[PDB]
Amino acid sequence: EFRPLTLPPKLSLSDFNEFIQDIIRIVGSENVEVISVDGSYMKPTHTHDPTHVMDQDYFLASAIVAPRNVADVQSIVGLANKFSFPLWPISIGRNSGYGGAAPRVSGSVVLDMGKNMNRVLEVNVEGAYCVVEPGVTYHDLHNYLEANNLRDKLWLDVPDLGGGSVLGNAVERGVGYTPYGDHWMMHSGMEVVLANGELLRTGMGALPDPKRPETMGLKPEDQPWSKIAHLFPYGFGPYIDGLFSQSNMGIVTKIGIWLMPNPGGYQSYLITLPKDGDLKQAVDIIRPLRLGMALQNVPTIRHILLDAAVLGDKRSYSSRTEPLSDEELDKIAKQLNLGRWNFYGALYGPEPIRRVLWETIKDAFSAIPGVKFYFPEDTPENSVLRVRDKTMQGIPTYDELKWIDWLPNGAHLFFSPIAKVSGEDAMMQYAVTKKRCQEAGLDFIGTFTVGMREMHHIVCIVFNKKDLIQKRKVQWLMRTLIDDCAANGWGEYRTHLAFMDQIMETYNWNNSSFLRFNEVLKNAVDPNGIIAPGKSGVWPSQYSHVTWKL
Amino acid sequence: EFRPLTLPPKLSLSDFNEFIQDIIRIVGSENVEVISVDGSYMKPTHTHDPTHVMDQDYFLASAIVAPRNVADVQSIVGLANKFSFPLWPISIGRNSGYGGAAPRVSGSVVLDMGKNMNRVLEVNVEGAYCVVEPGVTYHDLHNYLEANNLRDKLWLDVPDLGGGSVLGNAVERGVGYTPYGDHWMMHSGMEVVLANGELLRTGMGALPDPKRPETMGLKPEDQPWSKIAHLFPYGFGPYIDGLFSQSNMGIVTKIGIWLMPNPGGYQSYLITLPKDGDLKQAVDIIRPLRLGMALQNVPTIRHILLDAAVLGDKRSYSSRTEPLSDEELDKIAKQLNLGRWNFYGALYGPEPIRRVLWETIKDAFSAIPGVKFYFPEDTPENSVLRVRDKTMQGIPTYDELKWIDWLPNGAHLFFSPIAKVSGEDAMMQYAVTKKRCQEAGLDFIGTFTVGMREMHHIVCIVFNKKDLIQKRKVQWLMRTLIDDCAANGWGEYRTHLAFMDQIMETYNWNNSSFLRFNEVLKNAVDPNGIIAPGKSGVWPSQYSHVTWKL
Amino acid sequence: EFRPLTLPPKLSLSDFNEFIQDIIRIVGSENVEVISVDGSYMKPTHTHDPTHVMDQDYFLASAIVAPRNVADVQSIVGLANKFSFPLWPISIGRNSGYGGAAPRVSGSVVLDMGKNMNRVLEVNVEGAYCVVEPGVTYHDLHNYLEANNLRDKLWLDVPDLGGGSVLGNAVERGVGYTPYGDHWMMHSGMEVVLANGELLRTGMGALPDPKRPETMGLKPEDQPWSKIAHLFPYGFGPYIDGLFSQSNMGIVTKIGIWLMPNPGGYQSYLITLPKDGDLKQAVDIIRPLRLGMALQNVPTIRHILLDAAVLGDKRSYSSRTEPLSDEELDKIAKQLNLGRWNFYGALYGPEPIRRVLWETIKDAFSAIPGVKFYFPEDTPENSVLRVRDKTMQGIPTYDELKWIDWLPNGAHLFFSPIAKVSGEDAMMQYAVTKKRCQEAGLDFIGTFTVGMREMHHIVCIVFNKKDLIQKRKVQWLMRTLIDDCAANGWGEYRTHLAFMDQIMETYNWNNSSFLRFNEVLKNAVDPNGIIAPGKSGVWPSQYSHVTWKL
Ligand SMILES: Cc1cc2nc3c(=O)[nH]c(=O)nc-3n(C[C@H](O)[C@H](O)[C@H](O)COP(=O)(O)OP(=O)(O)OC[C@H]3O[C@@H](n4cnc5c(N)ncnc54)[C@H](O)[C@@H]3O)c2cc1C
Ligand SMILES: Cc1cc2nc3c(=O)[nH]c(=O)nc-3n(C[C@H](O)[C@H](O)[C@H](O)COP(=O)(O)OP(=O)(O)OC[C@H]3O[C@@H](n4cnc5c(N)ncnc54)[C@H](O)[C@@H]3O)c2cc1C
Ligand SMILES: Cc1cc2nc3c(=O)[nH]c(=O)nc-3n(C[C@H](O)[C@H](O)[C@H](O)COP(=O)(O)OP(=O)(O)OC[C@H]3O[C@@H](n4cnc5c(N)ncnc54)[C@H](O)[C@@H]3O)c2cc1C
């Protein structure tokens, strides 16, 4: 196909056509798409940012290409180095709130790895792990376990929505809610296509499986791994794995992920926190519990509107255009039988141990007045606890997508700072963020996810994607929160394409030493700068900073 | 000082002298030593390999230099870049079995970071972490906790000997025996002097602590860290920390380590396994227990001679020069009331939870005939269980150094492959290794340290350091084991200076893709190749592979 | 022609077409072929490996080009340097067992030099030599001698099959069976087209024939040579000839080969060795005889199945699918009146001298029980001795091709190590190789060719080219034999395209010094890396080792 709306920097239309003809030769016309619709979660759009925040011509692909296999990825990387064409690899492209599948540089080729590279490559019982291609969604691996009756032996760890890529979420260092919730830390053995086109396997994946008649003559991509590849992550020498998370250092084609054996007992629960100010004491109660193993998984502290929004849109609770008042928030809580803050958690393992930890949890939380405790059965049929009961045992759901529709043409953007597990710190961050949300004309909506010694505070900014004036206010809010949070010692762990530079500039101790060191590494491994230029604020030397940064 | 026994590659004597005079100017004559004695564990030697395996002129420093602070490290890196002089950074230099403090390249300057950069920088209770300089030994940190009564709130995690560096052991990715036993995984926030001499702080350490009057004007090195620096490791963007472990990518000056809060209950124990073949069933029993949390820490499976050697030398058990027979091993076991294999572990937490897990452990292990269970109190005063009882609660000891004296002029070398947590795999690796040990005229001595989905198999090769013929058999043994283990799908996790090249060559999947990628990173960050050339087999482009590899 | 199945690395289809249009301009459409059939020995296929062992897309040409003369070779080299297109020069392309005519790099242009560059350039009686182009097969030079009645004066030295190229076999350092059997050592004066396109003549070929009226104005390629060109190989200064054997240093267009004057008497013979174990004593008897001139030619020690396979396929002796047993081998021997090992040799020169050497040979071999001696006349009409009687006097035959059809879709691969001329060494190598052949499900088939102080041990692995599972077992066998033989101190002298890297890595003394030195020489003479990249494991700097090695 001939004329794309936007071409990559410095490439001619004739080179574009040459390049695209070459790719269609390799993967076929059915797998190459020239962009000469926002779609849905069900059918994610791969050409641009659906939940737009920025203006047109930002983050727009020139074409979408879907490799059939690793050989095609290597062939495409070779073509991209030949013509200096930027590539933007995605697995499933459901990074909604962070830009979807859109490229940081307009005119890039979006590399859809998941369409054809879809396979569950291995589920190992004794080693309790799985090996997956980019295309395996959490729902697919669930279905694979169920089909082979492996759910009695091994459980998954899933984020709020089931349609994400197991591998794509892990390389972004995403979060799930069982004891295996730190997705990036559960990995072991990855396969990567480097910018030079060569294939690399990390860790013990670099120790080749010994020759045998049955595996002779296989392409590198198709060879099996050695015995310790997905059991011990370090290998020998430099532990380079982390250079492939949240980065533009390579294209990930495979990954091993540790899986939790059925723990022999489970019980999810909900603790309701009556007052807005009860976040402080609750978080101080959470701290020692999280460090000591009474809280084994990644429990969450959800704000009333997050649960309210799951159950219905704004218009179903109030007809005001402005932010709901404190008083209206208390009324919604009462209607749903929830608190202003709602703590969701789970106990795993034998009844005798769960009982002891549960008494410890109840005893500690009883120090907050009017606290109430529920198990799934004690709540209504449409409750969030019933949905999260599945989530905290690794069963995928799609219920939580409903909060996005809080406003008429709801589109969401995530603001995601890290806070200490201390009531004082959490209250100060919430206060900072709640204030700015109100200055922008928006309702505060959010969760805290409880890591061991930190909390991920996920502020869900929802807005009308067709409302120009509100879109600008959303851009103001984000940028102002970034600066306010850094002035109080907090940085964000993940972001949308339009804020990556601003957030990388926040990590500027000692005159931006961190970014300078990363640029050195990027320019050495990617001399033509073809792999996702600008991902995380990391630009290759051919992309002028003056021209491209936001 | 003027004439060293060995000069670094391509440097003239006049440049050596100019350089050393420059350094003496910066750090003083008391902190600079020109090498123109093997020492002890108590006073580690910093000039060469004490437990020598290779000949003279290998791994010999030209001079030992001890920076007083980070500024001197920066100054010294500046001088090394100017003169093309290689540096070898050590923290305490007690890496016995792996080369001690000796440099990979003879003529290097050994940089003794621990002598003056010694401080316990911070012990935080609510975030349960500590921050340390290279010279903080495990014993020093212990003493610091005891002096401020912090042992009631926070425990350490220590390797077998308390004299190592908390930071140096973590960057080598060493092992300890409580639930915080994966030392490298407990880190968060590190400070590094790069080969270009610039200071860098990783993760949330890149997010600067906000300006305040009390901290104005401090040098970079002396600035405090922001609130989340030692609580959340990832920061934002590429996760580069792992490039500074088992590598030559930088000089580590500070590191944060997570510390376990007193668990509120502890009980160590020993399970004796009567037959040599009982390793198979025991490991198969261990597998599910280790994955499910009945085994929370890093339990070990010790061979009878490791415990026997702790108690006395070979001459105290037999006067044969050749390897003890199976029959003599059973006799020693009986004398000590141990089995041929001995499992040491611990339970942590409230009595009611420990009681349930202990019944689970006892019940599973009872499937092996003649199994016996002991608590520290049921054993003699000199027992290994009493020493390990302290080790598994974070208390440093020095008792285990005595197995090194198994032979007259005992020197040790560690052969350290990884195995699956499966009886079949463990037996096959032991069988391979025991056979070659016997071919070399040596006793098999070793331990398995039980990781979650893997085991580190530490084979302790001990030999008489003055016996030439035995030294050669040791060299043969090691290189043959490396090859045999690779042909059975096993690689080593850590090694001695003389075997780093051979072990990196084992990790050659896809025509050595892993080492090629590492070399590209090393040349880009260290263009003059002055930071520890050859560490882990990773050589900068100025060091010809033909000349330097072993 | 427009679209080839495979293109060379980094070249566009438009450049391919440009290049191919340019070549068709030079040599004509009849001499250029675009590959958009395994053929036979009679009509060798020039596009791929017929006796396939590896999978599709390996060793596949993009086009076959046939120069009309040396000017076209130079023009084509110029075009290849202009577009960076790899060339794979062949003479006849009958390197069956070593890859046929197939290129090491898929997408290469196969340069068929023999089609049009065919001439016997000179046969000199007084100097006893010949001068040949790539296209002269052993059968053609035989026919040339016969046509001009030169067989009474000069004899040839031929390998087992008559259709090979005299020059192609010599540059591979092939073997023949008269006293002139070391083909490479019989050469003198070669003409080469270098990678830069320039013409070079080696040795005394560099000393120009003095001007004369009759030779003025001839192109360099067409000039005659000086008097000593094909009589003394060294010339003056560096003796560079050997850089053009088994290498990618140049394209050979002409070569002088020494020819043996009729020796005035000849008699071939066969000595049958009854037992499998008789190889040991026989080889020990051969040693002093070979060194002293009782054995003047290159006598061979053939295994019973090699002779059996010449006479009929496996199905004609047994219907088992598995390897024939020892007992069945003894029965075949008895049926053919041969031993388990069969020694073929010849005596040259006057009757009185032959008689003396023959008595010496008989006397020595009589030390082995049940030895029998035959002359051609004492054997049946279809005997191997009758075929080899022609071979050892330089007369070409095609009988020996019949062993390839031992299995239904027989395809062969040669495993070719060198052994000492000692019974102990030969028995150990045979034992090693026989064992592995049996593990793969294959019959051991082989010969030893007796060089002066070494033996070439040619193991003929034959397999069904359509049997996937057996193909993989063949790949396992080869690679395992390579490693087993190097661990016992033996290397291979020649190999198939798929094992060249593995065999070059075996020659790694002093950290691969040999290959590093060869790469330095290759990159200097061939800066664009267009001449047979990868031949012998020698890759030019533009071919990433990670991507291309096998
Ligand atoms: C309602 C809602 C709830 C959510 N809940 C959670 C939650 O609980 N936890 C959570 O972590 N997230 C959550 N998310 C965010 C996001 O939806 C998920 O993280 C999702 O899994 C990310 O998308 P994906 O897996 O489809 O990844 P992708 O879009 O495919 O990938 C994300 C990014 O990873 C990189 N990448 C992906 N594949 C590759 C590859 N093969 N090679 C190189 N780089 C690659 C690219 O930079 C890419 O843009 C939520 C989102 C919404 C709307
Ligand atoms: C009897 C015995 C038992 C042992 N038991 C254990 C055990 O249970 N667990 C275990 O893990 N080990 C064990 N070891 C091995 C060793 O004793 C410890 O690992 C010890 O802590 C390593 O020494 P150090 O801490 O003195 O480190 P150092 O020698 O200071 O350092 C080791 C290496 O780390 C790198 N390095 C160190 N500091 C820096 C820096 N500041 N910058 C850059 N690079 C740096 C260098 O490559 C250096 O050579 C044992 C050894 C013996 C003899
Ligand atoms: C049954 C059987 C028996 C055999 N017996 C023998 C034997 O007794 N002795 C023996 O030596 N071999 C033997 N062979 C192997 C092979 O068949 C012969 O060696 C044959 O002569 C090699 O092929 P060719 O002459 O057609 O050469 P080619 O395929 O033309 O050339 C072989 C290689 O030489 C190089 N080369 C060729 N020409 C040039 C040139 N002009 N410039 C630069 N490089 C060039 C290339 O690398 C090329 O691939 C046997 C094979 C079989 C199947």
Ligand SMILES: Oc1ccc(C(F)(F)F)cc1
């Ligand atoms: O990055 C993230 C992490 C968690 C979530 C949520 F909201 F489900 F908790 C959203 C985005």
Ligand SMILES: Oc1ccc(C(F)(F)F)cc1
């Ligand atoms: O690298 C290591 C790890 C463990 C040990 C031991 F033996 F104490 F377990 C020694 C060396």
Ligand SMILES: Oc1ccc(C(F)(F)F)cc1
């Ligand atoms: O390279 C060679 C040499 C000899 C032979 C044979 F078998 F005729 F002896 C085959 C291949």
